[PDB]
């Protein structure tokens, strides 16, 4: 008797105001509602200009969200928008309610729908697939269309297997389903970070040109409670989708005359969604078709324009045979782990994801001296994790050669122990990376705590990490909490020094990765911090 | 003291005998002396097949077409020599050592005196059978088409290792493991008290999906699951497995251009030719004269010294063992019912029949014959008994066929031929006669006690012809499979299939509910008249 739908409000709104932000790159707008159709359950809703509300494009969006949600219905704003054929029901909204993001006129204006902040759910199986297309020359477009639609066919036989926990995925009468299969890996699991990697297996008892051979990943989620039978269906559907946007990206360059490109597997989970976005990339095309690319996507998958999303650099990687731009080794945002602090004032932090460099990594001692480097290593983390360069993490011997290119030091100083500062930072960075920096030079410990004022507008506008450089010893330092009526301040400082290759619970425990109160800075020595800018194209 | 091997001295004098039949003029011809291979399970020290050939078959080219037809767990262990003036294939660890005499005497003792570290064994076969149906795809470059398949066969066993074979039922997967990921006592709840013909485990096999004229060979590969077999020990096997049935069809191919019948593809057939305890693993070509056939026929009987009496490698023949393979009349219909049954012990001496067949009882094909069928019914598992053992081809006759022959035979008229009318084993005889020229030899009785009394008769027959024996009296026909006869107590029991009807192919309902089970001494009316029709199976391969 359940005929409620559940839809976050919030997050639709975000869409729409993200779409608004393209009067740079009028007509009507409309958008699809995607969700889960058996819970009734919204959970993708994109809004489009009149122009981009065909067939078309829809597919193209259903083939990238993960295969449990599918099309459940559309909406019309102000009641003039073009609506498509979609699903089973049609949000009516306004341009008044959207703008002022009004939930209060939303629910009385749309019935079956209550409000529901929406929460990611399930894990997420993972596994590489490979498959290869032949295209008759002269008819090459033809071909890739009549190629992925027999591949959906085929999708059936395909059998995807773990085997350090023997589990097998694959057709199966809805006899054999084995009812809380894998529940044991998605009870508490999050679609980001809890992974089941398979082999994607075939029986081997079925089977002037130009031939194409695509590899990439395929993720379908897996939730807690959901059979064997469930998870093929998904296994399935996630393949297709992952073939279908093969072919329109592949299809979508010959229209354009850029050729049949080559592809590349990426997944995402953009700012705020509770599902992953699954995208297939050409990475043949010129570095600048790409980007405009991004743009076309961020205005169909309503994502914001400033900082980029879809870069390649900050896809996920939940494949072991995925392709590293970072070392997989490394531990991915540390300071996200501890939950036990209470804020004692005004909470604010980095926005983004970065990699912790310590000591003892780089198969180097870095006993005293090492304390300077590191926090850069850990900055150039965030610029690579934001999808700003291509460009690996330095090393320290990489660091002082580009010291040296700058004539700065001293030439001796390539693999010189000797030690480098918040100033000598700001240095690397705009040399390798064309990349501005900005200071706060303190006299005192002191002072610094009376300038928390604008460290928090740093992490609120940049927000990328800081080193602070003073008494000998230099830090990193992800966050503030301050306390304009209390005056009482502390900081998130993430000691560069030596705590495990890896091993987050020792960190949280001894004050790494831990907060700190306002008197750790000594009163007596001077401090500097250097404030990483981002450049302004995404 | 230590190294002493096993083996079916026994067998191996059949299988001289096997060879020599050919000939049926021993010291008549001038021939090339006898020579031969000696394969078995070299780990345990087992001879399992010992295989004479003339002089001319002692080759490599020739030995390695007989290794990569036996199974997987067995090997070259070894030659013979006959009176000492055979030629030897240089190969294996020992040389049997054999006579004139002892190969005609079949003394088991003389053998055991000049080879020394033999021990006589009555070897029986172990394990149950994995089945895989594989596929594969050669290209041959018009010209050197006999130069690619060699190769082309060669990188595929390079390749083999890559190969995953699932069991979706159980959940039971074998691939490449590391030697220490290995899953002992991996099948035993399979391979525990089995037999390679009718104990099956079906995988199918899988391949990573990320990894002129064209040829494509399609088929089954069988390899041997034992009890206390390792994940790792299923793994070696199942790999030499499918290597050996490539090379077979590779081998096939090769020589068959240099016969004449150029590039045919090949159909895979699996035998349990008579006294062997290990399959025979053939790769057979589909298109050739039907003289090319005959002979190729002839040959692989020479080869692997088969009897040149009873047929063995007929398609017919060939084992189900995978559910896709290709069947002869296996329709729904399910094949020797008798041996799905372990509720039974014997109360004295059992002979059974010697060969398979298949259970036909009522409205199975397609009309509803009810109460006048039964005597049919029995002549259909008559008939699949010589299209399952190699003595036709021809398929199993409707009720207006068998009807037909009656009057073409000039025995009941041609209103029989329409008819619902009652038949028995005197009408069974002359059909068998008419359609297949065959020869019937009856049991004629006045009672069924009689029946009980002239048991002997019919276990002689099981142990001689093999063949199903229907039995018609008091308004019923049967079929006897088997009996078990204690020749001090008197007591006598009879393995009855009933050609009465029940539902479809299920065992558990024929099993249990009696439809074919043993029965007792006073299954049989005393106050009626008993016949059985006893068919004769001819004399050629």
């Not at 099309?71 to 703008?99: A, K, W």
């Not at 009468?173 to 999050?190: C, I, N």
């Not at 010959?254 to 992953?276: D, E, H, Q």
């Not at 480097?373 to 580009?402: C, M």
Request: proline fraction near 4%; glycine fraction near 6%.
């Amino acid at each position: 008797v359940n005929e409620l739908w559940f839809i976050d409000a919030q997050a639709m709104f975000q869409n729409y105001a993200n779409l608004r932000s393209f009067s740079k790159s009028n007509t009507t707008i409309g958008g699809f509602v995607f969700g889960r159709k058996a819970r009734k359950q919204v959970i993708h809703v994109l809004f489009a200009y009149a122009e981009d509300l065909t067939e078309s494009n829809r597919q193209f969006l259903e083939s990238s969200l993960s295969a449990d949600i599918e099309l459940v219905g559309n909406l019309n704003i102000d009641g003039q928008s073009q609506i498509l054929p979609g699903g089973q029901f049609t949000l009516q909204l306004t341009s008044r309610m959207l703008e002022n993001r009004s939930i209060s006129e939303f629910l009385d204006m749309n019935v079956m729908f209550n409000n529901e902040h929406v929460l990611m759910e399930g894990a997420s199986c993972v596994s590489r697939v490979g498959y290869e297309w032949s295209l008759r020359a002269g008819r090459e477009q033809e071909d890739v269309k009549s190629a992925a639609e027999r591949l959906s066919m085929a999708s059936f036989r395909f059998t995807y297997l773990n085997a350090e926990h023997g589990l097998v995925i694959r057709e199966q009468k809805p006899e054999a389903a084995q009812q809380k299969y894998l529940d044991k890996f998605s009870k508490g699991a999050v679609p980001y970070k809890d992974v089941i990697e398979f082999t994607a297996m075939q029986s081997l008892t079925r089977d002037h040109f130009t031939r194409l051979v695509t590899i990439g990943e395929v993720v379908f989620p897996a939730f807690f409670g959901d059979s064997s039978l469930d998870l093929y269906k998904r296994s399935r559907e996630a393949f297709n989708r992952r073939a279908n946007n093969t072919m329109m990206v592949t299809v979508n360059g010959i229209r354009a005359g850029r050729g049949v490109t080559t592809t590349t597997s990426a997944t995402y989970l953009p700012p705020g969604w509770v599902s992953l976005l699954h995208l297939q990339l050409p990475t043949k095309w010129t570095d600048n078709e790409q980007r405009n690319y991004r743009i076309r996507l961020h205005k169909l998958f309503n994502l914001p324009s400033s900082k980029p999303v879809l870069r390649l650099s900050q896809a996920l990687a939940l494949h072991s045979e995925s392709a590293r731009l970072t070392n997989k080794k490394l531990i991915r945002e540390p300071h996200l782990s501890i939950t036990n602090y209470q804020p004692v004032g005004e909470i604010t932090t980095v926005n983004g994801p970065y990699n912790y460099h310590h000591y003892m990594q780089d198969g180097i001692d870095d006993s005293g001296w090492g304390s300077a480097y590191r926090s850069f290593q850990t900055i150039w983390s965030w610029f690579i994790l934001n999808g700003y360069t291509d460009k690996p993490v330095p090393s320290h011997r990489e660091i002082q050669q580009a010291l040296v290119d700058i004539q700065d030091k001293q030439a001796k100083f390539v693999g010189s122990r000797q030690w480098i500062g918040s100033t000598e930072i700001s240095f690397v960075l705009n040399e390798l990376l064309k990349l501005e920096c900005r200071f706060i030079a303190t006299n005192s410990g002191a002072e610094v705590v009376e300038r928390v004022r604008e460290l928090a507008r740093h992490f609120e506008t940049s927000g990328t990490p800081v080193m602070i450089g003073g008494n000998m010893l230099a830090h990193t330092i992800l966050g503030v909490d301050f306390n304009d009526t209390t005056g009482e301040t502390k900081f998130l400082v993430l000691d560069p020094h030596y705590t495990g290759s890896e091993d987050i619970k020792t960190i949280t425990s001894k004050g790494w990765c831990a907060w700190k109160p306002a008197s750790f800075w000594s009163k007596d020595h001077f401090y500097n911090m250097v404030l990483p800018q981002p450049p302004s194209d995404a």
